[PDB]
Structures are given as C-alpha cells and as structure tokens.
Amino acid sequence: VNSLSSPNSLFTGHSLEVGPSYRLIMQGDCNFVLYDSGKPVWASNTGGLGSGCRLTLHNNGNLVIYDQSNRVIWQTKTNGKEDHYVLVLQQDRNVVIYGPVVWATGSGPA
C-alpha cells in the first residue's frame, strides 16, 4: 500500500511502498524516512527522539508523529476543514497530502 487515509496511523516499523525502490517508513527510532533504493532522500529528521512512535494523518489534514508517551514530536501544522484527507507516496517519488474529499464510490468502509 502506498497511501494512508485520515484518521488512520502508520505504526512503528510499518511503511508505505511504491515498488521497486520507494519506501516511506515510520521507524522504530521515531524517524519518518523516505528511502530510494536504500538511500534516504527525505525525512522528518526525528530519529532518536523517541520509540514506539506512530505517524497520524488527521481528518483536518494535519500530519503528526507521536512518540511512545503519546506526545507530538513533529507535525506539518496543516489544520484545515474537518473532512477526510490522504497521504500518498507517489510513483514520481513525491509524498503528498491531498484533501478534502472531492468524490467517493461509497464502496467502503466494508
């Protein structure tokens, strides 16, 4: 999967991936990093600032990293209209937050 929809989280050790070289991972050392064939090309630069951290995209568009103590250690500060948003690791290697909802099939949640 290469997307994370609000208000869900990407937990410790989990990643968004776009084969065969792109991996955006919420690391166990709290750093949120994008690797291109093993080389880090973007990151929140929060390594060592915690453990058991998670990445959460909120229903207002704000992206945040919480540590084990459930505290904020990094955020995009993009507080907009209450709706639904999505974070996407794209095939062009860009990582983007899109929203609000424009249209939906309604085939889910199911």
Ligand X SMILES: OC[C@H]1O[C@H](O[C@@H]2[C@H](O)[C@@H](O)O[C@H](CO)[C@H]2O)[C@@H](O)[C@@H](O)[C@@H]1O
Rounded CA gap, 91 and 16, in Å? 11
Which one of 14-22, 63-71, 72-80, 91-99 is the stretch in contact with ligand X (CB under 6 A)?
A: 91-99
Q: Which does 107 bind (CB under 5 to 8 A by kind): ligand X, a copy of itself, none?
A: a copy of itself
Torsion of CA 101, 86, 60, 44, to 10 degrees: -160
- By the rule CB under 6 A, 104 interacts with ligand X: yes
- Those residues whose C-beta lies under 8 Å from the C-beta of residue 1, and which sit 6 or more positions away, are 16, 17
Quick check: bond before 40 cis, omega within 30?
Answer: no
Which one of 20-28, 50-58, 62-70, 84-92 is the stretch in contact with ligand X (CB under 6 A)?
A: 84-92
- Those residues whose C-beta lies under 8 Å from the C-beta of residue 103, and which sit 6 or more positions away, are none
For the bound state, the minimum distance from the C-beta of residue 65 to a copy of itself, rounded and expressed in Å, comes to 14
**Binding footprint of a copy of itself on the chain (CB under 8 A):** 1-3, 5, 18-19, 34, 36, 41-42, 61, 63, 76, 78, 80, 84-86, 88, 90-110
